[PDB]
Design a protein around this ligand. Structure first.
Ligand SMILES: *[C@@H]1O[C@H](CO)[C@@H](O[C@@H]2O[C@H](CO)[C@@H](O[C@H]3O[C@H](CO[C@H]4O[C@H](CO)[C@@H](O)[C@H](O)[C@@H]4O[C@@H]4O[C@H](CO)[C@@H](O)[C@H](O)[C@H]4NC(C)=O)[C@@H](O)[C@H](O)[C@@H]3O)[C@H](O)[C@H]2NC(C)=O)[C@H](O[C@@H]2O[C@@H](C)[C@@H](O)[C@@H](O)[C@@H]2O)[C@H]1NC(C)=O
Ligand SMILES: *[C@@H]1O[C@H](CO)[C@@H](O[C@@H]2O[C@H](CO)[C@@H](O[C@@H]3O[C@H](CO)[C@@H](O)[C@H](O)[C@@H]3O)[C@H](O)[C@H]2NC(C)=O)[C@H](O[C@@H]2O[C@@H](C)[C@@H](O)[C@@H](O)[C@@H]2O)[C@H]1NC(C)=O
Ligand SMILES: OC[C@@H]1[C@@H](O)[C@H](O)[C@@H](O)c2nc(-c3ccccc3)cn21
Ligand SMILES: *[C@@H]1O[C@H](CO)[C@@H](O)[C@H](O)[C@H]1NC(C)=O
Length: 602
């Protein structure tokens, strides 16, 4: 007879309610299982009724894969899930945190920190729209963004994924959501999930909650703060995400006052779902439930019980799915975990799938391939790159002639530094590889390239990654541009207690600037000890992690556009002041939030 859930002309809730009514137990749990593509197989996916797949940092089908290949891969997996008795389509998620950053040839936009310096939430909304197209260009329908953490201690290896330390800023920046998912209807209820169609993608606000408040900025650690401070600092943006209709929420690895977020039934269920009235689905993090115990995985049986009862709807296993499903099947068979729970988690996972119309467009659109790396997107990124640069210094002394903007016509000029011609570096973490990489890892334009493509044909550009004083003073240069800074990092692998850039860097800035007037470009995902650099430089620019369009940098350096960006974070004097944020008593910055020197165009 007539199968309601299959009829597209029917209401979302009606269809969810109808399908859930036909589901066994194995299928309901299947919908709650998300696994790495690495352990996925048509059989596995079909036999275990897998409801979702993902790709961790660098989990690509083939290094250098085209968009078609990706689509084919995803389509391969979907073909399998569609063959289940009920034919429930799977949702493929990936970390498209600053473009479809895992794909080769994908436009790599500035990381969050840099975007916050722009204060242009509309620019961010356009980035989300772009990223939507490029993630859909590869057949994927779910991006694990935006990360709306409010980094409070730059020693945290994930600070670059935080728009600001000022929640107000992080809120205005949730505009990425409507960009990735499309805008929500006038009526729209705050908390209901939403996605416009096959040209948009489901978004994920992460990581609930207080991931940017751990002690010392130790990744995944504990956040010791009172409910009020937690609610007015780290909680706010989420409220915004509810109104903008965010589709999902990933839970943080970090604990609050000693309690693992994955086990926090009060915040996850009581506050997020019950109070904020979140109707989309909640997903764990990579082995996030295993990390509830200590050691991790020491009692997976507890992790399922504790996490599922806490209120989580989907688990990112992402490898030992057989265990996860066996363990959960048991708990339900034992009455330990009530079916109402499973019913709820599935109800949410489904509601989101019908809403985005996954049941109507489960397969890719080869027409969408072209989107990947589209020039218009690169221009957009280029714009954001320029707008995110924050001028800290521009003249060794009050009386000096402003170094920037530099002339495009000069006899001979010098570009140097470790980050000068290193695409991987200017891109930073989460680029091609999980930890990011060094060198020409994708399609882009390094700073050097931009420069050679901006100066007058009669301007001799000489490159020297790390020259000595002697070389510079004898070069006959009119000026030099040195780029240095941090190296690509991601999560824990990036926590830093000394926060001083790697060498050589300062040695190079000092060697070059001591030989000729210089403009120093600092590549970093956060504020770092900068006095030494500022001291040796005539002008110094904080470019954070610009991404693939180096021209964004040179656009400012040569005055085609003037610096407008302003510090999204507080720049410290020494790392022992930390934590130190706007509003604190001992607030003794080296550069307050909002600081940013400027210049004018043409
Ligand atoms: C401040 O604290 C930081 C972390 O808390 C320190 O950085 C970390 O230092 C350890 C060594 O103590 C280092 O060791 C691990 O990585 C080794 C290889 O490191 C290179 O490759 C990785 C990626 O593969 C990069 O992330 C590293 O940044 C590093 O990159 C190379 O750096 C060279 C010099 O800067 C450069 O010539 C290369 O081109 C560049 N190569 C690439 C591909 O980028 C590995 O052998 C070892 O077994 C460990 O696994 C960590 O890698 C390093 N940082 C990170 C993010 O992991 C920091 O130490 C200082 O700075 C470092 C960059 C390094 O030069 C140290 O020798 C130096 O003491 C601390 N700074 C201070 C002043 O104390
Ligand atoms: C020369 O460069 C200065 C750089 O500040 C320009 O003035 C600044 O223009 C901003 C708008 O572009 C002013 O408004 C706000 O700026 C922030 C930047 O953080 C924007 O994000 C925000 O949306 C606002 O628009 C800013 O206040 C202003 N700075 C000062 C000290 O007034 C200047 O622009 C020209 O003068 C200013 C006063 C405005 O009237 C501009 O509209 C006007 O074009 C630049 N000159 C030129 C020709 O562009
Ligand atoms: O890439 C998927 C998610 C990402 O969206 C989350 O923000 C982040 O917490 C995260 N850590 C790992 C991860 C960490 C260690 C080993 C293997 C994987 C994986 N992930
Ligand atoms: C925090 O980090 C410390 C040191 O790495 C570790 O001993 C402790 O168990 C962690 N605690 C939490 C709550 O993450």
């Amino acid at each position: 007879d007539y199968v309601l859930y299959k009829d597209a002309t029917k209401p979302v809730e009606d269809r969810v309610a109808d399908l859930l009514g036909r589901m066994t137990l194995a299928e309901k749990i299947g919908q709650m299982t998300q696994i790495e593509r690495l352990v996925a197989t048509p059989d596995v996916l079909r036999d275990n009724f897998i409801g979702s797949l993902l790709s961790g940092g660098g989990s690509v089908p083939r290094k250098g894969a085209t968009a078609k290949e990706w689509q084919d891969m995803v389509d391969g997996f979907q073909k399998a899930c569609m063959s289940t008795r009920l034919g429930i389509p799977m949702i493929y998620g990936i970390d498209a945190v600053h473009g479809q950053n895992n794909v080769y040839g994908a436009t790599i936009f500035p990381h969050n920190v840099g975007l916050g310096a722009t204060r242009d939430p509309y620019l961010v909304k356009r980035i989300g729209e772009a990223t939507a197209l490029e993630v859909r260009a590869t057949g994927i329908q779910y991006a694990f963004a935006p990360c709306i953490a409010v980094c409070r201690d730059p020693r945290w290896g994930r600070c670059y994924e935080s728009y600001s330390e000022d929640r107000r800023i992080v809120q205005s920046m949730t505009e990425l959501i409507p960009g990735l998912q499309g805008d929500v209807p006038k009526d729209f209820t705050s908390g209901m999930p939403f996605v416009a169609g096959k040209n948009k993608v489901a978004a994920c606000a992460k990581h609930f909650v207080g991931d940017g408040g751990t002690v010392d900025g130790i990744n995944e650690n504990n956040t010791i703060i009172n409910r009020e401070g937690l609610m007015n600092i780290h909680m706010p943006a989420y409220k915004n995400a509810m109104d903008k209709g965010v589709s999902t929420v990933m839970i943080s690895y970090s604990s609050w006052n000693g309690v693992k977020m994955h086990a926090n039934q009060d915040l996850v269920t009581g506050y997020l779902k019950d109070t904020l009235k979140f109707k989309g689905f909640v997903i764990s993090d990579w082995e996030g439930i295993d990390r509830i115990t200590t050691p991790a995985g020491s009692d997976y049986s507890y992790s399922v019980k504790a996490s599922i009862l806490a209120g989580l709807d989907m688990i990112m296993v992402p490898n030992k799915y057989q265990q996860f499903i066996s363990i959960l099947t048991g708990h339900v068979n034992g009455g330990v975990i009530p079916m109402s729970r499973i019913d709820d988690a599935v109800t949410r996972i489904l509601r989101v799938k019908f809403t985005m119309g996954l049941f109507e467009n489960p397969y890719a659109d080869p027409a969408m391939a072209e989107q990947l790396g589209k020039q218009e997107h690169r221009d957009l990124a280029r714009e954001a790159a320029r707008k995110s640069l924050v001028l800290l210094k521009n003249g060794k002394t009050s009386t000096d002639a402003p170094l920037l903007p530099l002339p495009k016509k000069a006899p001979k000029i010098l570009v140097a530094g470790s980050h000068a011609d290193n695409l991987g570096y200017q891109c930073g973490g989460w680029t091609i590889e999980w930890q990011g990489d060094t060198g020409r890892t994708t399609v882009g334009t390094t700073i050097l390239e931009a420069v050679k493509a901006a100066v007058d044909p009669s301007t001799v550009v000489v490159f020297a990654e790390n020259p000595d004083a002697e070389f510079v003073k004898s070069g006959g240069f009119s000026y030099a541009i040195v780029a240095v800074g941090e190296h690509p990092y991601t999560e824990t692998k990036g926590d830093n207690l000394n926060l001083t850039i790697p060498e050589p860097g300062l040695s190079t800035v000092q060697a070059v600037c001591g030989g000729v007037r210089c403009a120093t470009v600092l590549i970093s995902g956060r504020p770092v000890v900068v006095q030494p650099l500022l001291a040796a430089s005539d002008a110094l620019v904080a470019a954070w992690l610009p991404g693939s369009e180096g021209q964004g940098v040179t656009d400012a350096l040569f005055g085609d556009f003037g610096f407008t960006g302003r510090l999204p974070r507080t720049w410290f004097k020494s790392v022992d002041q930390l934590p130190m944020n706007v509003g604190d008593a001992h607030y003794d910055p080296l550069f307050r939030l909002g600081y940013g020197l400027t210049t004018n165009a043409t």
